[PDB]
């Protein structure tokens, strides 16, 4: 009775919520390519997730009191009619040590809220966290899919006005193959595209190697919703 | 010219070497189910990898001076004719703090030897590390596939005379689908089988959730060699 092609059933009325979180709290000063690239990432992400059928919410940690309200409300919501949940963590490239340390606490809080014990509404439903990296950054959970812009011990290359290499290469793959390929198959393409995107500065010969940790159990497809 | 179905070319004359490493150095005393289960794992693994076409070598850290010889020789070998490399780390369930700390150092050494800079013979060839878990256990590298018996913050359940849940459920999937399915697809089945294998002791209601971190870039297939 064991099925090697079993998929997470994406038949529910709602696809789910796509949370786009921007880490901007303690970045002391921003160049315009830094201000412009994070915006292109939020918009390119909002487009691609909306096309697959996601409800998109964008938050910033600049509004400290609003944040606790915004994070709590989304956690309390029930996802019984949702197929899956998606969270995206956007962080700037070169920040101070407090900015990066705050990033670790926020990722550990966000992933912790949707664990099996804390979110019965998402049990057996995939929880997809896409993290853009800068005392741990590697958590776990059942039916979780953790996607990192850069693996441990690898460098991430500077943000541009067009955006970030990981995001833009993810969005382009989502637009071309969002409904076509399985998500792990799609992310494997992002790994090759970003790694092959090997590119005036003192960082010559360096490649950005993305990574995804999968605790999923069934195949993940995003066939056109209806 | 971008191909969404591109695979690592498995046409080379040799498939590669399958390294089965047994961590037995500082385990102070062993019950017979502990002595018997690790043996069933080594043998069930040797069978399944040999069928796919792997050269199997088994090492133990009990022979301290032999170990440095054995680890070094395999690292120096050239894998130009090999398709891929596979390493398996077998550790006992409940050990002391030194046994587990030695496990971290050995995994960090083994994975470090086959990084892109240290093994030109395996550049662009997949490096597959299957770790049975017990100051870090999460390393990285290009074209690496890290497979863990249990994710972080999850418990692994005791070894039996038949073997370990992760290994036996991996071998059974390898025998049925070793040549059929893609490796990441195959490991996704191991995640479901072990997690569904929810099972008299004080650990009631606990599930073992496996995990795999993928830095691969192309699809991985093990079609019958010839």
Tab-separated table of C-alpha atoms in Angstrom:
chain	number	residue	atom	x	y	z
A	1	UNK	CA	0.000	0.000	0.000
A	2	UNK	CA	3.074	2.254	0.127
A	3	UNK	CA	3.049	4.837	-2.672
A	4	UNK	CA	6.433	6.188	-3.895
A	5	UNK	CA	4.749	9.114	-5.710
A	6	UNK	CA	2.372	10.284	-2.967
A	7	UNK	CA	2.004	14.074	-2.821
A	8	UNK	CA	0.806	16.543	-0.227
A	9	UNK	CA	-2.806	17.037	-1.281
A	10	UNK	CA	-3.137	20.606	-2.605
A	11	UNK	CA	-6.929	20.425	-3.042
A	12	UNK	CA	-7.926	22.720	-0.144
A	13	UNK	CA	-9.889	25.875	-0.975
A	14	UNK	CA	-6.954	28.114	-0.012
A	15	UNK	CA	-3.339	27.594	-1.020
A	16	UNK	CA	-2.044	29.324	2.093
A	17	UNK	CA	-0.313	32.472	3.285
A	18	UNK	CA	3.056	33.669	1.985
A	19	UNK	CA	4.837	35.688	4.662
A	20	UNK	CA	7.589	38.033	3.446
A	21	UNK	CA	9.599	39.280	6.429
A	22	UNK	CA	12.189	42.033	5.949
A	23	UNK	CA	14.994	42.344	8.499
A	24	UNK	CA	15.712	46.085	8.688
A	25	UNK	CA	15.853	46.804	12.423
A	26	UNK	CA	19.482	47.558	13.318
A	27	UNK	CA	21.033	48.179	9.894
A	28	UNK	CA	22.749	51.429	10.808
A	29	UNK	CA	23.042	52.976	7.341
A	30	UNK	CA	21.897	51.913	3.892
A	31	UNK	CA	23.327	52.601	0.463
A	32	UNK	CA	20.803	53.034	-2.311
A	33	UNK	CA	21.694	49.709	-3.995
A	34	UNK	CA	20.946	48.214	-0.575
A	35	UNK	CA	17.661	50.119	-0.249
A	36	UNK	CA	16.696	49.279	-3.839
A	37	UNK	CA	17.635	45.594	-3.939
A	38	UNK	CA	15.605	44.542	-0.905
A	39	UNK	CA	12.594	46.239	-2.511
A	40	UNK	CA	13.053	44.358	-5.791
A	41	UNK	CA	13.197	41.144	-3.753
A	42	UNK	CA	9.946	41.883	-1.915
A	43	UNK	CA	8.156	42.748	-5.163
A	44	UNK	CA	9.562	39.934	-7.271
A	45	UNK	CA	8.628	37.528	-4.478
A	46	UNK	CA	5.133	38.990	-4.055
A	47	UNK	CA	4.504	38.577	-7.784
A	48	UNK	CA	5.631	34.956	-8.009
A	49	UNK	CA	3.853	33.717	-4.875
A	50	UNK	CA	0.636	35.519	-5.799
A	51	UNK	CA	0.648	33.757	-9.177
A	52	UNK	CA	0.878	30.340	-7.504
A	53	UNK	CA	-2.067	31.406	-5.347
A	54	UNK	CA	-0.639	32.716	-2.082
A	55	UNK	CA	-1.940	35.438	0.204
A	56	UNK	CA	1.049	37.735	0.688
A	57	UNK	CA	1.820	39.773	3.792
A	58	UNK	CA	4.953	41.888	4.176
A	59	UNK	CA	6.348	42.894	7.567
A	60	UNK	CA	9.317	44.914	8.772
A	61	UNK	CA	11.005	44.801	12.162
A	62	UNK	CA	11.349	48.609	12.167
A	63	UNK	CA	7.935	48.929	13.850
A	64	UNK	CA	8.802	47.136	17.077
A	65	UNK	CA	5.351	47.253	18.691
A	66	UNK	CA	3.478	46.574	15.450
A	67	UNK	CA	5.722	43.534	14.951
A	68	UNK	CA	4.514	41.620	18.009
A	69	UNK	CA	0.944	42.245	16.847
A	70	UNK	CA	1.650	41.194	13.260
A	71	UNK	CA	3.583	38.019	14.108
A	72	UNK	CA	1.029	36.890	16.695
A	73	UNK	CA	-2.071	37.349	14.531
A	74	UNK	CA	-0.686	35.227	11.679
A	75	UNK	CA	0.280	32.494	14.158
A	76	UNK	CA	-3.214	32.369	15.682
A	77	UNK	CA	-4.923	32.099	12.281
A	78	UNK	CA	-6.129	28.621	11.351
A	79	UNK	CA	-4.835	27.098	8.116
A	80	UNK	CA	-7.405	24.282	7.877
A	81	UNK	CA	-8.458	25.521	4.430
A	82	UNK	CA	-4.846	26.273	3.464
A	83	UNK	CA	-2.642	23.790	1.622
A	84	UNK	CA	0.717	24.977	2.970
A	85	UNK	CA	2.540	27.860	4.639
A	86	UNK	CA	5.444	29.878	3.227
A	87	UNK	CA	7.729	32.275	5.104
A	88	UNK	CA	10.549	34.330	3.586
A	89	UNK	CA	13.297	36.042	5.592
A	90	UNK	CA	15.052	38.900	3.773
A	91	UNK	CA	18.259	40.311	5.259
A	92	UNK	CA	20.902	42.692	3.963
A	93	UNK	CA	24.333	41.505	2.874
A	94	UNK	CA	26.938	43.226	5.063
A	95	UNK	CA	25.636	44.213	8.496
A	96	UNK	CA	26.998	44.684	11.990
A	97	UNK	CA	27.111	41.949	14.618
A	98	UNK	CA	23.887	43.008	16.339
A	99	UNK	CA	21.948	43.012	13.067
A	100	UNK	CA	23.097	39.450	12.345
A	101	UNK	CA	22.458	38.320	15.930
A	102	UNK	CA	18.927	39.718	15.815
A	103	UNK	CA	18.446	37.764	12.576
A	104	UNK	CA	19.141	34.494	14.397
A	105	UNK	CA	16.608	35.221	17.151
A	106	UNK	CA	13.902	36.189	14.655
A	107	UNK	CA	14.386	33.074	12.511
A	108	UNK	CA	14.301	30.855	15.605
A	109	UNK	CA	11.072	32.514	16.750
A	110	UNK	CA	9.326	32.354	13.368
A	111	UNK	CA	10.152	28.712	12.655
A	112	UNK	CA	9.298	27.793	16.249
A	113	UNK	CA	5.767	29.187	16.033
A	114	UNK	CA	4.726	26.761	13.272
A	115	UNK	CA	6.116	23.560	14.782
A	116	UNK	CA	3.750	20.609	14.954
A	117	UNK	CA	2.896	21.174	18.616
A	118	UNK	CA	2.275	24.923	18.213
A	119	UNK	CA	0.199	24.879	14.987
A	120	UNK	CA	-2.288	22.011	14.766
A	121	UNK	CA	-3.771	23.694	11.687
A	122	UNK	CA	-0.597	22.961	9.676
A	123	UNK	CA	0.056	19.401	10.882
A	124	UNK	CA	0.736	17.216	7.860
A	125	UNK	CA	0.935	20.367	5.707
A	126	UNK	CA	4.321	21.565	4.398
A	127	UNK	CA	5.951	24.549	6.118
A	128	UNK	CA	8.383	26.267	3.741
A	129	UNK	CA	10.932	28.752	5.117
A	130	UNK	CA	13.175	30.603	2.656
A	131	UNK	CA	16.003	32.307	4.563
A	132	UNK	CA	18.453	34.868	3.204
A	133	UNK	CA	21.492	34.522	5.449
A	134	UNK	CA	23.760	37.314	6.661
A	135	UNK	CA	23.589	31.028	18.460
A	136	UNK	CA	22.277	28.834	15.635
A	137	UNK	CA	20.755	29.343	12.182
A	138	UNK	CA	19.774	25.692	11.536
A	139	UNK	CA	16.491	24.586	13.177
A	140	UNK	CA	14.191	21.617	12.469
A	141	UNK	CA	10.611	20.347	12.438
A	142	UNK	CA	8.271	17.787	10.861
A	143	UNK	CA	7.142	18.491	7.280
A	144	UNK	CA	9.514	21.488	7.205
A	145	UNK	CA	11.436	22.721	4.160
A	146	UNK	CA	14.311	25.068	5.018
A	147	UNK	CA	15.866	26.955	2.092
A	148	UNK	CA	18.992	29.050	2.654
A	149	UNK	CA	20.485	31.610	0.288
A	150	UNK	CA	23.999	30.412	1.159
A	151	UNK	CA	25.299	27.305	2.901
A	152	UNK	CA	27.479	27.357	5.998
A	153	UNK	CA	31.026	28.484	5.299
A	154	UNK	CA	30.119	30.125	1.981
A	155	UNK	CA	29.894	33.795	1.120
A	156	UNK	CA	26.850	35.654	-0.175
A	157	UNK	CA	27.481	38.318	-2.789
A	158	UNK	CA	26.432	41.916	-2.574
A	159	UNK	CA	22.909	43.135	-3.210
A	160	UNK	CA	22.282	45.117	-6.395
A	161	UNK	CA	19.553	47.416	-7.670
A	162	UNK	CA	18.068	44.445	-9.531
A	163	UNK	CA	18.013	42.443	-6.296
A	164	UNK	CA	19.766	39.410	-4.815
A	165	UNK	CA	21.186	36.507	-6.798
A	166	UNK	CA	19.355	33.897	-4.722
A	167	UNK	CA	15.980	35.658	-4.848
A	168	UNK	CA	16.001	36.683	-8.509
A	169	UNK	CA	17.215	33.222	-9.539
A	170	UNK	CA	14.480	31.733	-7.345
A	171	UNK	CA	11.733	33.955	-8.767
A	172	UNK	CA	12.751	33.278	-12.370
A	173	UNK	CA	12.630	29.549	-11.634
A	174	UNK	CA	9.250	29.977	-9.932
A	175	UNK	CA	7.798	31.844	-12.903
A	176	UNK	CA	9.037	29.288	-15.426
A	177	UNK	CA	8.518	26.119	-13.356
A	178	UNK	CA	6.350	27.068	-10.369
A	179	UNK	CA	3.506	24.845	-11.581
A	180	UNK	CA	5.668	22.541	-13.721
A	181	UNK	CA	8.273	20.932	-11.446
A	182	UNK	CA	8.333	19.604	-7.908
A	183	UNK	CA	9.574	22.146	-5.385
A	184	UNK	CA	12.700	20.214	-4.383
A	185	UNK	CA	13.428	19.745	-8.086
A	186	UNK	CA	12.846	23.470	-8.603
A	187	UNK	CA	15.197	24.408	-5.753
A	188	UNK	CA	17.883	22.094	-7.141
A	189	UNK	CA	17.788	24.303	-10.236
A	190	UNK	CA	18.249	27.408	-8.072
A	191	UNK	CA	21.342	25.757	-6.588
A	192	UNK	CA	22.908	25.272	-10.018
A	193	UNK	CA	21.901	28.692	-11.353
A	194	UNK	CA	23.289	30.642	-8.390
A	195	UNK	CA	26.417	28.478	-8.163
A	196	UNK	CA	27.022	28.873	-11.909
A	197	UNK	CA	26.439	32.624	-11.510
A	198	UNK	CA	30.114	32.874	-10.547
A	199	UNK	CA	31.110	36.545	-10.628
A	200	UNK	CA	35.953	43.895	-9.955
A	201	UNK	CA	35.978	43.450	-6.130
A	202	UNK	CA	38.447	41.583	-3.911
A	203	UNK	CA	36.136	38.524	-3.970
A	204	UNK	CA	37.416	36.788	-7.111
A	205	UNK	CA	36.809	33.116	-7.839
A	206	UNK	CA	34.121	32.836	-5.150
A	207	UNK	CA	30.828	31.010	-5.702
A	208	UNK	CA	27.614	31.262	-3.691
A	209	UNK	CA	26.338	27.730	-3.003
A	210	UNK	CA	22.682	27.672	-1.849
A	211	UNK	CA	21.239	24.860	0.251
A	212	UNK	CA	17.908	23.359	1.245
A	213	UNK	CA	17.182	21.050	4.183
A	214	UNK	CA	14.113	18.869	3.647
A	215	UNK	CA	12.016	17.265	6.366
A	216	UNK	CA	9.138	16.803	3.921
A	217	UNK	CA	7.570	13.366	3.522
A	218	UNK	CA	5.484	13.633	0.329
A	219	UNK	CA	6.228	15.253	-3.013
A	220	UNK	CA	5.411	18.964	-3.249
A	221	UNK	CA	3.656	20.290	-6.353
A	222	UNK	CA	1.969	23.633	-6.987
A	223	UNK	CA	-0.312	22.724	-9.879
A	224	UNK	CA	-2.541	25.612	-11.026
A	225	UNK	CA	-5.249	26.204	-8.438
A	226	UNK	CA	-8.970	26.101	-9.223
B	1	UNK	CA	20.036	26.326	-23.162
B	2	UNK	CA	19.141	25.747	-19.500
B	3	UNK	CA	17.906	22.196	-18.891
B	4	UNK	CA	15.518	21.610	-15.937
B	5	UNK	CA	16.078	17.820	-16.075
B	6	UNK	CA	19.882	17.747	-16.339
B	7	UNK	CA	21.463	14.890	-14.376
B	8	UNK	CA	24.920	14.156	-13.044
B	9	UNK	CA	26.335	11.974	-15.807
B	10	UNK	CA	26.714	8.441	-14.400
B	11	UNK	CA	28.472	7.060	-17.499
B	12	UNK	CA	31.986	6.699	-16.023
B	13	UNK	CA	33.523	3.215	-15.933
B	14	UNK	CA	33.333	3.085	-12.124
B	15	UNK	CA	30.351	4.093	-10.013
B	16	UNK	CA	32.541	5.041	-7.069
B	17	UNK	CA	33.508	3.965	-3.571
B	18	UNK	CA	31.019	3.444	-0.742
B	19	UNK	CA	32.701	4.086	2.601
B	20	UNK	CA	31.007	2.554	5.656
B	21	UNK	CA	32.533	4.024	8.820
B	22	UNK	CA	31.621	2.560	12.217
B	23	UNK	CA	32.058	4.741	15.304
B	24	UNK	CA	33.040	2.306	18.070
B	25	UNK	CA	36.016	3.981	19.752
B	26	UNK	CA	34.886	5.148	23.202
B	27	UNK	CA	31.633	3.219	23.668
B	28	UNK	CA	32.434	1.903	27.128
B	29	UNK	CA	30.169	-1.159	27.168
B	30	UNK	CA	27.864	-2.747	24.619
B	31	UNK	CA	24.699	-4.769	25.031
B	32	UNK	CA	24.181	-7.539	22.519
B	33	UNK	CA	21.299	-5.743	20.742
B	34	UNK	CA	23.803	-2.900	20.373
B	35	UNK	CA	26.544	-5.222	19.101
B	36	UNK	CA	24.104	-6.998	16.773
B	37	UNK	CA	22.269	-4.002	15.316
B	38	UNK	CA	25.356	-2.138	14.118
B	39	UNK	CA	26.416	-5.334	12.333
B	40	UNK	CA	23.056	-5.681	10.571
B	41	UNK	CA	23.440	-2.061	9.451
B	42	UNK	CA	26.914	-2.629	7.999
B	43	UNK	CA	25.768	-5.751	6.143
B	44	UNK	CA	22.444	-4.410	4.918
B	45	UNK	CA	24.277	-1.313	3.687
B	46	UNK	CA	27.063	-3.321	2.031
B	47	UNK	CA	24.470	-5.383	0.160
B	48	UNK	CA	22.456	-2.444	-1.156
B	49	UNK	CA	25.412	-0.299	-2.242
B	50	UNK	CA	27.138	-3.247	-3.910
B	51	UNK	CA	23.999	-3.888	-5.970
B	52	UNK	CA	23.990	-0.300	-7.256
B	53	UNK	CA	27.640	-0.825	-8.189
B	54	UNK	CA	29.729	0.566	-5.341
B	55	UNK	CA	33.095	-0.568	-4.035
B	56	UNK	CA	32.533	-1.001	-0.302
B	57	UNK	CA	35.115	-0.463	2.423
B	58	UNK	CA	34.335	-0.769	6.129
B	59	UNK	CA	36.436	0.911	8.815
B	60	UNK	CA	36.336	1.095	12.598
B	61	UNK	CA	37.897	3.705	14.856
B	62	UNK	CA	38.975	0.989	17.323
B	63	UNK	CA	42.284	0.589	15.457
B	64	UNK	CA	43.628	4.080	16.074
B	65	UNK	CA	46.838	3.778	14.041
B	66	UNK	CA	45.230	1.783	11.230
B	67	UNK	CA	42.570	4.502	11.005
B	68	UNK	CA	44.921	7.295	9.936
B	69	UNK	CA	46.275	4.968	7.246
B	70	UNK	CA	42.821	3.908	6.056
B	71	UNK	CA	41.308	7.405	5.938
B	72	UNK	CA	44.328	8.892	4.162
B	73	UNK	CA	44.606	6.265	1.419
B	74	UNK	CA	40.965	6.653	0.348
B	75	UNK	CA	41.376	10.444	0.263
B	76	UNK	CA	44.462	10.255	-1.970
B	77	UNK	CA	42.776	7.917	-4.470
B	78	UNK	CA	41.599	9.564	-7.682
B	79	UNK	CA	37.921	9.256	-8.593
B	80	UNK	CA	38.257	10.355	-12.236
B	81	UNK	CA	36.668	7.086	-13.381
B	82	UNK	CA	34.144	7.171	-10.523
B	83	UNK	CA	30.681	8.685	-10.871
B	84	UNK	CA	30.190	9.703	-7.233
B	85	UNK	CA	31.376	9.131	-3.671
B	86	UNK	CA	29.339	7.779	-0.752
B	87	UNK	CA	30.259	7.845	2.941
B	88	UNK	CA	28.202	6.377	5.786
B	89	UNK	CA	28.728	7.180	9.472
B	90	UNK	CA	27.316	4.585	11.885
B	91	UNK	CA	27.089	5.464	15.582
B	92	UNK	CA	25.409	3.823	18.550
B	93	UNK	CA	22.250	5.218	20.111
B	94	UNK	CA	22.997	6.074	23.751
B	95	UNK	CA	26.651	6.893	24.407
B	96	UNK	CA	28.670	9.021	26.791
B	97	UNK	CA	29.677	12.616	26.107
B	98	UNK	CA	33.153	11.750	24.825
B	99	UNK	CA	31.785	9.206	22.350
B	100	UNK	CA	29.404	11.821	20.929
B	101	UNK	CA	32.092	14.525	20.905
B	102	UNK	CA	34.470	12.242	19.018
B	103	UNK	CA	31.650	11.659	16.518
B	104	UNK	CA	31.540	15.379	15.713
B	105	UNK	CA	35.293	15.589	15.080
B	106	UNK	CA	35.267	12.522	12.826
B	107	UNK	CA	32.338	13.759	10.721
B	108	UNK	CA	33.980	17.173	10.332
B	109	UNK	CA	37.224	15.526	9.214
B	110	UNK	CA	35.610	13.105	6.756
B	111	UNK	CA	33.392	15.677	5.048
B	112	UNK	CA	36.279	18.157	4.988
B	113	UNK	CA	38.579	15.819	3.066
B	114	UNK	CA	36.279	15.678	0.020
B	115	UNK	CA	35.564	19.397	-0.318
B	116	UNK	CA	36.051	20.904	-3.757
B	117	UNK	CA	39.483	22.320	-2.938
B	118	UNK	CA	40.780	19.089	-1.359
B	119	UNK	CA	39.510	16.563	-3.951
B	120	UNK	CA	39.796	17.740	-7.555
B	121	UNK	CA	38.875	14.210	-8.654
B	122	UNK	CA	35.318	14.648	-7.310
B	123	UNK	CA	34.671	18.213	-8.506
B	124	UNK	CA	31.280	18.315	-10.196
B	125	UNK	CA	30.594	14.791	-8.889
B	126	UNK	CA	28.089	14.268	-6.050
B	127	UNK	CA	29.456	13.588	-2.559
B	128	UNK	CA	26.859	11.743	-0.468
B	129	UNK	CA	27.281	11.541	3.320
B	130	UNK	CA	24.772	9.486	5.318
B	131	UNK	CA	25.176	10.265	9.030
B	132	UNK	CA	23.617	8.389	11.938
B	133	UNK	CA	23.472	10.959	14.725
B	134	UNK	CA	24.032	10.339	18.428
B	135	UNK	CA	30.929	21.793	18.320
B	136	UNK	CA	28.811	21.351	15.183
B	137	UNK	CA	27.240	18.466	13.259
B	138	UNK	CA	26.092	20.482	10.205
B	139	UNK	CA	28.820	21.161	7.599
B	140	UNK	CA	28.600	22.193	3.926
B	141	UNK	CA	30.181	21.927	0.482
B	142	UNK	CA	29.464	22.139	-3.254
B	143	UNK	CA	27.639	19.165	-4.809
B	144	UNK	CA	27.238	17.683	-1.308
B	145	UNK	CA	24.264	15.642	-0.091
B	146	UNK	CA	24.065	15.350	3.702
B	147	UNK	CA	21.607	12.770	5.059
B	148	UNK	CA	20.958	12.578	8.804
B	149	UNK	CA	19.182	9.800	10.677
B	150	UNK	CA	17.450	12.367	12.903
B	151	UNK	CA	16.992	16.120	12.623
B	152	UNK	CA	18.109	18.602	15.258
B	153	UNK	CA	15.948	18.541	18.368
B	154	UNK	CA	14.508	15.095	17.605
B	155	UNK	CA	15.208	11.791	19.294
B	156	UNK	CA	16.576	8.645	17.674
B	157	UNK	CA	15.136	5.358	18.881
B	158	UNK	CA	17.090	2.456	20.240
B	159	UNK	CA	19.012	0.007	18.094
B	160	UNK	CA	17.627	-3.520	17.781
B	161	UNK	CA	18.977	-6.879	16.659
B	162	UNK	CA	17.426	-6.241	13.241
B	163	UNK	CA	19.229	-2.896	13.044
B	164	UNK	CA	18.341	0.802	13.069
B	165	UNK	CA	15.076	2.287	11.843
B	166	UNK	CA	16.808	4.821	9.595
B	167	UNK	CA	19.211	2.313	8.032
B	168	UNK	CA	16.781	-0.563	7.505
B	169	UNK	CA	14.164	1.820	6.097
B	170	UNK	CA	16.871	3.287	3.852
B	171	UNK	CA	18.095	-0.104	2.627
B	172	UNK	CA	14.576	-1.349	1.884
B	173	UNK	CA	13.958	1.811	-0.138
B	174	UNK	CA	17.298	1.353	-1.909
B	175	UNK	CA	16.503	-2.241	-2.845
B	176	UNK	CA	13.048	-1.387	-4.175
B	177	UNK	CA	13.846	1.996	-5.759
B	178	UNK	CA	17.642	2.298	-5.916
B	179	UNK	CA	17.597	2.302	-9.724
B	180	UNK	CA	13.993	3.497	-10.093
B	181	UNK	CA	13.696	6.880	-8.355
B	182	UNK	CA	15.887	9.937	-7.981
B	183	UNK	CA	17.933	9.920	-4.790
B	184	UNK	CA	16.274	12.980	-3.241
B	185	UNK	CA	12.914	11.427	-4.113
B	186	UNK	CA	14.094	8.162	-2.555
B	187	UNK	CA	15.224	9.898	0.645
B	188	UNK	CA	11.886	11.710	0.898
B	189	UNK	CA	10.342	8.243	1.146
B	190	UNK	CA	12.747	7.340	3.964
B	191	UNK	CA	11.564	10.458	5.799
B	192	UNK	CA	7.930	9.354	5.634
B	193	UNK	CA	8.633	5.701	6.442
B	194	UNK	CA	10.731	6.429	9.537
B	195	UNK	CA	8.409	9.212	10.712
B	196	UNK	CA	5.374	6.951	10.234
B	197	UNK	CA	7.254	4.197	12.091
B	198	UNK	CA	5.983	5.792	15.304
B	199	UNK	CA	6.580	3.346	18.157
B	200	UNK	CA	6.794	-0.119	26.274
B	201	UNK	CA	9.515	2.437	27.221
B	202	UNK	CA	9.168	5.933	28.690
B	203	UNK	CA	9.413	7.405	25.158
B	204	UNK	CA	5.741	7.304	24.143
B	205	UNK	CA	4.313	9.412	21.332
B	206	UNK	CA	7.769	10.282	19.978
B	207	UNK	CA	8.610	10.223	16.267
B	208	UNK	CA	12.030	10.130	14.614
B	209	UNK	CA	12.094	12.731	11.821
B	210	UNK	CA	15.015	12.224	9.389
B	211	UNK	CA	16.478	15.053	7.325
B	212	UNK	CA	18.614	15.635	4.253
B	213	UNK	CA	20.470	18.813	3.280
B	214	UNK	CA	21.078	19.102	-0.463
B	215	UNK	CA	23.782	21.172	-2.129
B	216	UNK	CA	23.414	19.141	-5.325
B	217	UNK	CA	22.856	20.945	-8.621
B	218	UNK	CA	21.720	18.201	-11.030
B	219	UNK	CA	19.319	15.308	-10.568
B	220	UNK	CA	20.840	12.138	-9.108
B	221	UNK	CA	19.936	8.769	-10.626
B	222	UNK	CA	21.528	5.353	-10.158
B	223	UNK	CA	20.336	3.594	-13.302
B	224	UNK	CA	21.697	0.038	-13.665
B	225	UNK	CA	25.379	0.195	-14.561
B	226	UNK	CA	26.860	-1.423	-17.669
